[PDB]
Symmetry: D2
Subunit: 267 residues, 4 copies
């Protein structure tokens, strides 16, 4: 197994289509022992995580809660055994209030909303690292999820800005984590299609992206030299696990693209 004997904390599992779910699934298939986090309705998280290959303990973590963050290392140690430390941490937490996205005018997003999206999506990558580094092994690896924000694009709007900030945070976290031998990297994934139910009785599932976002996302498979399957999270999950492994041991503060090569081409 690529991650045999490694102990890995995975944040961000909300549904069975959360990219963190597939990261967790591949890591377990590759021999890792997981610790999972959730915040709201832990019982509902427990139901999803019971669909993973192997059991895994669930810890409560609201990344905006300094008390949760302050106690996390000790709660991790309780569950993995006090002599043991983590080898990997996955940050898969991204959120921006809807006023900051979609067809809401970019200029109309209230600061309070954008600040919260910045907190959850970018600042919390630093918060999580600070919280977990005291219980990580030398040579360990922290990986966060990115969506390339180098160029502006329709709909992604202020979430793009939060990802630009996240990329910058990642470089400082790598500086801090490196002092104790830990790597920090982001995976810039191509778009993965997400379904959500209409919030009404009789509701059905349907694509979350609106028209403009869908048109934007369909460009990836057109551009990607090896194509891009928006319904397939597995290549992204494998890439995260590559960074959690010891096979990129000299990469840190960096961004690895799992996007079919789309960002390298222009049509």
């Amino acid at each position: 197994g690529l991650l045999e004997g490694k102990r890995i904390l995975v944040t961000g599992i909300i549904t069975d289509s959360s990219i963190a779910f597939h990261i967790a699934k591949v890591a377990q298939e590759q021999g890792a022992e997981l610790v999972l986090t959730g915040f709201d309705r832990l019982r509902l998280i427990e139901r999803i995580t019971q669909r993973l290959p192997k059991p895994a303990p669930l810890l409560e973590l609201d990344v905006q809660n300094e008390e949760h963050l302050g106690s996390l290392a000790g709660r991790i140690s309780e569950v993995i055994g006090e002599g043991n430390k983590l080898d990997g941490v996955v940050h898969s937490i991204g959120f921006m209030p809807q006023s900051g996205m979609g067809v809401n005018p970019f200029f109309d997003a209230p600061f309070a909303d954008v600040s919260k999206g910045f907190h959850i999506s970018a600042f919390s990558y630093s918060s999580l690292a600070k919280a977990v580094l005291p219980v990580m092994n030398r040579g360990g690896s922290i990986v966060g999820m990115d969506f390339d924000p180098t160029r502006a694009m329709p709909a992604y709007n202020w979430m793009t800005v939060a990802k630009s900030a996240l990329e910058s945070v990642n470089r400082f976290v790598a500086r801090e984590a490196g002092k104790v031998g830990v790597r920090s990297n982001l995976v810039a994934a191509g778009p993965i299609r997400t379904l959500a139910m209409s919030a009404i009785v009789g509701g059905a599932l349907g694509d979350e992206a609106g028209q403009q976002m869908q048109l934007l996302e369909e460009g990836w498979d057109q551009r990607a030299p090896i194509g891009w399957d928006m319904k397939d999270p597995t290549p992204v999950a494998k890439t995260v696990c590559a960074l959690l492994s010891d096979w990129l041991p000299a990469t840190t503060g960096d961004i690895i693209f799992a996007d079919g090569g789309a960002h390298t081409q222009l049509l």
Copy 2:
């Protein structure tokens, strides 16, 4: 002159060594008609602006105050005349609480501090653009100030994160401004200069690298090259540049050593 007849709003004048002061000075030397803004130390700013080549009116603007922002377009029109519009706007406001700029470890900066610095240094570029675009002419130019955040650096810490955010914001402001024919760009400037302390010492050592790297050298005591570059972007001579970042750093960022 380079900006002959252009009406330009300049934010960020604090002292007569502020880069905004030198931007305003060069712009007036090049024929611009200015409107200035201030908030903190507003009487002091009026005194400072008397040292400019020419007088200019001053409007109060706290870029965190949505009432100040919503009234700004009407207040500008009152100053310049209701049938006239601005051709240029300069965003030269950067603030990050010291806890985000190296007086403590990176990890110790509290969110409330970093959020405020993000608000002032990144979000408000969008706020100001939203406020001014209704009174800007087609072909106009919004320019903000940047400090290259592509790589992490000693001490600059969360201000560098804010500037990465600002660069992203600029690309979206360009999208919105272009709908009415207005450009939006940043200038990535090189650094401009007993109780001294660690964060200041770290920044000093980092900043001395620019002159070492810059093929044409870098004078940390000379704001004029940066001010001239801003005026270039305010002029009609970069009419197809938007969403972009122009480096005024001696070429330091293009060289490894």
Copy 3:
């Protein structure tokens, strides 16, 4: 009413027709008060007739940028034009050539090395050659500007010319090092694209090039060379005095947007 380049002496390469971007660079420069020296090699008689359509007279020197004798004599021949006590303030490299095998008339892999090397020579290496030849007669504070087409991403048809432009960007950063020793700046302008027997490569390029106006926040007019010409003149001026080794985009903002 001072012009942007008032009193400056500027050498301009690359004028082939009155549609050449170099023609428009020269035209705007003269409108802004510059005194020009022009160069040509192929179709010299044609170039002379073309250069007479510029606003003001300008002498024409022969320069094959692959000819080391032409390069080596260039500084002395410039001094004859402008006076031994005078120097140039600006130099424009607007020479790009890649044999058609490197620009999409056949698949990328089929381009022969000899063709690609020739295009590398003319489109990338000669930026360094020209700088070497002109710098001894350039003033401190002067400016060398070359023409770029953003090669950060692979594109249809442009193929090995894109590779040459990647190389050119790297050359520019090294020319900046050498030029900086005598106070001279070196930069590239990355321009957006400027416009029955139509053929495949041209069709691919047209479809690709129409995307600039779609992406550009301020639009992009492929029929209008003036914004690019002005941007070159901005770099030749004293208004970007701390920019060197760099790439300035004159593309409507298209490269900053995905859609």
Copy 4:
């Protein structure tokens, strides 16, 4: 093994200090079956490759020789078995005549020298791909070696230009290789110290880098959040094998940095 059952062609083994030697070593340790190339003193290359963990056939390949390139596929099929194809190809070929490097003035490099370095160091990445793609499996991987040329630097001079060209070539090779399901990527390695002998009777080993290049290379360990060991090729060799594996399956046209994180930091 990370590369169990994979057939991989490795170019560029000159000495037992060539990065390609260490790539070949790790690939064999990870279960790969190799085919090796050489051009100069094939008997001397056979002697170097006998120190690899396992035997591997050696094929002659001058990448400037179109007859060598045109026959390469058939000569590969002969040695790996007529029904078989390659899963991986490593390009580790870089050369610039000395007039193009060091304390030679940048402006004094003759074009014929720079053209030759461009041919060997950049054009030949396309030539090798063209020659080997007919005998590569879908899902295969081509990996070339890079030294980050994003900024100019002392000494590296025209080789920097060649690497800039190589990066561009890699993005076009990715477009072409992707049509048959093959990825193409570069590894941008930190500097690896190289010793060479003075060309004199009684000669000794010493660093090939001149003063300015040594000062440049020494910055990596200072900048790198996890440090950078110029004497250790292994992290770079491992990163190449990561790209040859199936664990970065959606990465193509790209550049993976194995440099300790140094390019993400500024002092």
